[PDB]
Symmetry: C4
């Protein structure tokens, strides 16, 4: 698998579980929506409203600075170490 | 050009067709809008509302993780291997 | 100045003038707003509504793919070749 | 740590204080909201409305160009020089 990708994967899931728990609890979201927000926020897509609560905004500011690096690193490794080899193997003629 | 840019181009179009098909079918969008969402979502611009359905949100979460890398790699190759040479050639007196 | 940064700067301004002209004309925006959109769109910040018109959406899709690379390259060079030296010079004790 | 991360940290806080002061004063926002906008705007997340005033839009255009590089450089250094070592040390049995 490659221990780095594996670890990046775990950390990213941990980061997303944490956001998911925080947003459903504090912003009153359904888990699906708290997870959805966490994800589109850390990947910087952002096509949702902002948080309503001041805790929500605060946590969110911290969550982005601490979380964006992990998330983008995971994507990088996924693309470089997972997807690129898959594509390679799939462009082989047999 | 080069087979690499060409392939990256095809994959990106495939990824965008797939999103287009998914969003028009599941979120009920006109193809233009499903394509428009796919594109602004994978490039992370996101200037639209979120998906309405739970399938839509689920697929979208997966589509971002799997798709952002391809899309940004394609833009990278386009910039480096297509646009930069074009600008070079067209700065020559 | 450094000819590369200079050229990147010009291209980015050209790209932004083009978007500014397109959006004020086709989406009916005030120039300030057409420029504002162009900018937050190419930098991927996106905190505006989408385009209304189908031409608008089409042009926008093409404008992002062709424009995001230039814009981010310009930012990179600005940060590396302009801002970093300024900061350096400004951390010198005299 | 290292003087570099430290400096990048200070500059980012300075850039965010400046945006905070600007937006609360010119766009009439509570400091929490002016800080919140500054942050999601420079990190490019953007999940809020745009500025209302023309000064606000102008400043914001400039603030993105000048500020995005600092902010992303700081995140880079934080990830590379702070978070990676922390994770390393805490994977040791």
């Amino acid at each position: 698998k490659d221990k780095e990708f594996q670890v990046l994967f775990v950390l990213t899931i941990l980061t997303l579980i944490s956001g998911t728990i925080f947003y459903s609890t504090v912003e009153g979201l359904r888990p699906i929506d708290a997870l959805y927000f966490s994800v589109v926020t850390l990947t910087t897509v952002g096509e949702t409203p902002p948080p309503q609560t001041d805790f929500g905004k605060i946590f969110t500011i911290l969550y982005i600075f601490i979380g964006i690096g992990l998330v983008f690193g995971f994507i990088h490794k996924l693309a470089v170490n997972v997807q690129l080899p898959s594509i390679l193997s799939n462009l082989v003629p047999r």
